Nucleic acid binder design. Structure first.
Lengths: 82, 47, 175, 59, 119, 94, 137
RNA sequence: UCUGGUGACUAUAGCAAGGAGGUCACACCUGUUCCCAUGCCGAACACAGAAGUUAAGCUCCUUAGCGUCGAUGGUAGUCGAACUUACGUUCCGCUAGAGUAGAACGUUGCCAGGC
RNA sequence: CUGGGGCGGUCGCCUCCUAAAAGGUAACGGAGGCGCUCAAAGGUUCCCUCAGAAUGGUUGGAAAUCAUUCAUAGAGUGUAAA
RNA sequence: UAUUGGAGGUAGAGCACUGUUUGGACGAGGGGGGUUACCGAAUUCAGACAAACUCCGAAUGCCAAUUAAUUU
């Protein structure tokens, strides 16, 4: 098994299961996480809060809707009608 | 940097645990905190 | 209030006709003057800062704010945030009176062949000039001073370019 | 001004012998040698100057 | 040579920075104020529907007079308070624009406060 | 400078386009002032003759259906391998 | 003359070689060009051989443009070692060429001399080639 | 459509240029005694005022120089399938990026004074 | 553990690529970090806007500070990377 | 499966950032206080390269639906 040649890099960290966690159109309950991220790839919208780890979660019960903010930004909102 | 126990000056209880740098803060730090025994904010000291 | 009256009595009269202005507002009004000394070798010392305080504290009527070094310049010991440089701006009647005194005391100690100089310019209408603390403090003698420095002076005017600055220097200045 | 930090200035009367260019100012709060009114009642600290006597361009 | 600028744009920039938290609903409308060199306006705005519920100004004939422009702010506070009370709005949220919180704007808010507007 | 073309119809598949190109005819479109967008095909040899006749820039009379359009070649796609024109753009001036 | 060469990473995944040439498919500097009709790696040492062959056949005549550059480094494990224990050291530098890429351009010389020079260069090269002219029309 | 607030749209909204515009006041301006005011200016902030000016800001009209938008057609790629071991081929859907013609020097809700 | 063992290297956590546009995903694959720091570098309120470039200047190692116009954020964000 | 909405940056493209690059214009700094060749860059023109580049960006997979058809 080879010899004195060895590698200095076989390291990685544990992957964090980030990304979207709910879909447009589906009803969710309040407190449901909608999007895990680092920084703000997606901003909180209507009735959506932003956690200390930048997690986006629903504030009330209702349907989730991803929307544009302006030219190059996105947001997620929750709307009450059920 | 060392651990610190903050003891209520009035109640007497050791209510909070925090940290400090022993060179930047070479004294017994004091700050106002909520003593749950007396239901009020009292002075706590590093004791 | 000498050049204060002189503006509206001679400059707003003659410059308004030498260069045409449709309304009375393009009369190039001198706004303020900045008198930053510059940089002294004030890294092993911290007292020539107080001397540059006494100057510009005594000549002009305001103590100079000691602006700190923005970046950590190499070679010389410039720590980001290490104090080098003074600054005062005159705007009101103090500005007029300071200019009037300056044009009355520049030439005697300046020894300038022109009288002050011809042009040291940023190509846009302001001095950023150099001095050797000769013309300044006629009020207080040289016997009580410690160094030799010269301020970075400019002219903030409603004018546009150095061409107009030459026309406006006619107020007992020497272009 | 760059005020906030400021002592007492004054429009002093630099009434020198060379056209009395008392259109000047400074903190030279000395004794009023000539408490005149065409110029300020301040000290004529400017005593001798060539600013209006000998100009190497227009002498 | 520097440029003097109109102060309304810097005001409006701070105003957008302050409107990020400030928003008017119907139950709690937003009391905006616009301050100029001579006059000040103020409106009761519902942002949830983008409508103005009440309005007052120092230009207004029923309030225009010769005063020190702070007493006028006091009058506009009372007038906007009365209009809101007539329409049935008690609790509001005060939008200061970007004009600090002082002088005329402070007097305006205070005058609204003595006249019923709960904020 | 009197090139003629044939009106292409809708939905030409990949196979249709390559069978068209394997002959001596190329797809092209015409657009511009005085007309609407029309997709046509022109024989490659005749196009080459017309271009060497009137040049790279030259008001070519293009026969589309029944009508002749005063048109110029705005752009064209070339295949450096097996040197051959693959598509042409014709813009109408009049 | 060249630039000071240094790469951000010295050990890179080997290039994709399937497909057609992305760009550089036309003669744009010179009058004649040598284009590839198959795909291989060109190893910064075939380029120098081909360039010497061409420029020496023209006797310092027209201009030569090398349209391909060896950006990609490749590694080779030392002799007589087992599999694994990391990645080998850099052996050399390659450019991947695909069918259609113009490899060399020449100008300031007759068509016959250019054709002969590009033939000679093509023989020093691990790819099938074709002589092309500045495309017009 | 007027002017000033305010707010809804991905700059089609912007930059730049040339030219008009004057108390509805929008700004400019006069000053610091008045709250305030600025490590460091009545600069700014704040205040008292309305005597000079459309000059500038702002509002309006033109322009595609700039930024922004942008098809159709074709191409690259590719889901599936049929061949095949070729740096492949064929058929059927989907269908870019770049570029081209072109669009575009804003639309719009509420409120107040104007008309 | 190991492209047989031994020798060499490695062993837990973080960031990236490999990773095939959800998530996940291996190799003794390719790169780096961590075992802290800060009583303000935390909370809140109110203000502020950057690097650089010349049109440049008493210094002028060039560029210290200072002056004016552009500066899409290229600066800074306690630290590795995203 | 059909229809609609959404998250995301792969193939491909592209050079707007990070960096590698080949020719050509243009003026200029140490330097043959300057010339002049150049040399290090300022600014442009045309061409290319990238797993740890992206102004862009599919096919498909993925999540879910007031919902339909067929199945189990």
């Amino acid at each position: 098994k080879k010899g004195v040649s060895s590698t200095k890099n076989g390291r990685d960290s544990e992957s964090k299961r980030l990304g979207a966690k709910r879909a447009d159109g589906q009803f969710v309950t309040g407190g449901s996480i909608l999007y895990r991220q680092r920084g703000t790839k997606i901003y909180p919208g209507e009735n959506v809060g932003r956690g200390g780890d930048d997690t986006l979660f629903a504030k009330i019960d209702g349907v989730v809707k991803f929307e544009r903010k302006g030219r190059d930004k996105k947001q997620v909102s929750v709307y009450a009608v059920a | 940097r060392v651990n610190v126990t903050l003891a209520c000056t009035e109640c007497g209880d050791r209510n909070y645990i925090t940290t400090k740098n022993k060179r930047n803060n070479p004294e017994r730090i004091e700050m106002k905190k909520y003593c749950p025994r007396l239901n009020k904010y009292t002075l706590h000291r590093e004791t | 209030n000498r050049l204060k009256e002189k503006f509206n009595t001679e400059v707003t009269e003659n410059l308004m006709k030498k260069f045409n202005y449709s309304s009375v507002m393009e009369v190039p009004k001198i706004d303020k003057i900045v008198v930053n000394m510059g940089v002294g070798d004030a890294v092993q010392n911290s007292k020539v800062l107080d001397n540059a305080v006494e100057e510009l504290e005594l000549i002009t009527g305001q103590k100079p704010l000691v602006t700190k070094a923005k970046k950590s310049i190499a070679t010389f010991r410039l720590r980001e945030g290490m104090p080098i440089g003074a600054k005062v701006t005159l705007r009101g009647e103090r500005m007029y009176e300071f200019l009037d005194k300056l044009i009355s005391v520049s030439l005697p100690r300046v020894r300038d062949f022109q009288g002050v100089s011809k042009k040291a310019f940023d190509g846009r209408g302001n001095y950023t000039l150099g001095v050797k603390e000769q013309l300044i403090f006629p009020e207080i003698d040289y016997d009580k001073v410690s160094k030799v420095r010269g301020m970075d002076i400019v002219i903030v005017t409603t004018a546009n370019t150095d061409e107009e600055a030459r026309e406006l220097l006619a107020n007992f200045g020497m272009p | 001004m760059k005020q906030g930090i400021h002592p007492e200035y004054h429009q002093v009367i630099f009434l020198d012998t060379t056209t009395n260019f008392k259109f000047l100012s400074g903190s030279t709060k000395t004794s009023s040698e000539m408490m005149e009114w065409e110029d300020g009642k301040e000290y004529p600290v400017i005593r001798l100057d060539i600013s209006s006597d000998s100009h190497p361009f227009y002498t | 040579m520097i440029s003097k600028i109109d102060k309304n744009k810097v005001r409006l920039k701070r105003h957008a920075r302050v409107r990020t938290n400030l928003s008017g609903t119907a139950e709690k409308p937003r009391l905006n104020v616009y301050r100029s060199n001579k006059h000040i306006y103020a409106q009761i705005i519902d942002d949830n529907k983008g409508v103005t519920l009440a309005q007052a100004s120092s230009k207004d004939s029923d309030i225009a007079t010769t005063a020190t422009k702070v007493e006028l702010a006091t009058k506009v506070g009372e007038a906007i308070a009365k209009k809101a009370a007539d329409k049935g709005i008690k609790e509001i949220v005060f939008d200061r624009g970007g004009y600090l919180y002082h002088g005329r704007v402070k007097a305006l808010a205070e005058a609204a406060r003595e006249s019923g507007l709960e904020f | 400078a009197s090139l003629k073309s044939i009106i292409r119809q809708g939905k030409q598949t990949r196979s249709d386009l390559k069978q068209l190109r394997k002959s001596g005819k190329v797809p092209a479109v015409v657009y511009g002032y005085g007309t609407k967008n029309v997709s046509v095909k022109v024989d490659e040899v005749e196009f080459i003759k017309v271009i060497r006749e009137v040049g790279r820039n030259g008001v070519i009379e293009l026969g589309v259906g029944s009508k002749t359009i005063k048109v110029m070649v705005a752009d064209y796609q070339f295949d450096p391998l097996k040197n051959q024109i693959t598509h042409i753009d014709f813009l109408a001036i009049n | 003359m060249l630039l000071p060469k240094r790469v951000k990473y010295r050990r890179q995944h080997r290039p994709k070689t399937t497909g057609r040439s992305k760009g550089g498919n036309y003669v744009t500097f010179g009058e004649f060009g040598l284009q590839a009709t198959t795909t291989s790696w060109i190893t910064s040492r075939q380029i120098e051989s081909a360039r010497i062959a061409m420029t020496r056949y023209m006797k310092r005549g027209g201009k030569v443009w090398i349209k391909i550059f060896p950006h990609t480094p490749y590694t080779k494990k030392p002799l007589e070692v087992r599999m694994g224990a990391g990645k080998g050291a850099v052996e050399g530098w390659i450019a991947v060429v695909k069918p259609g890429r113009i490899l060399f351009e020449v100008a300031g010389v007759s068509e016959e001399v250019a054709r002969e020079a590009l033939r000679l260069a093509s023989h020093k090269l691990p790819v099938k080639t074709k002589f092309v002219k500045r495309e017009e029309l």
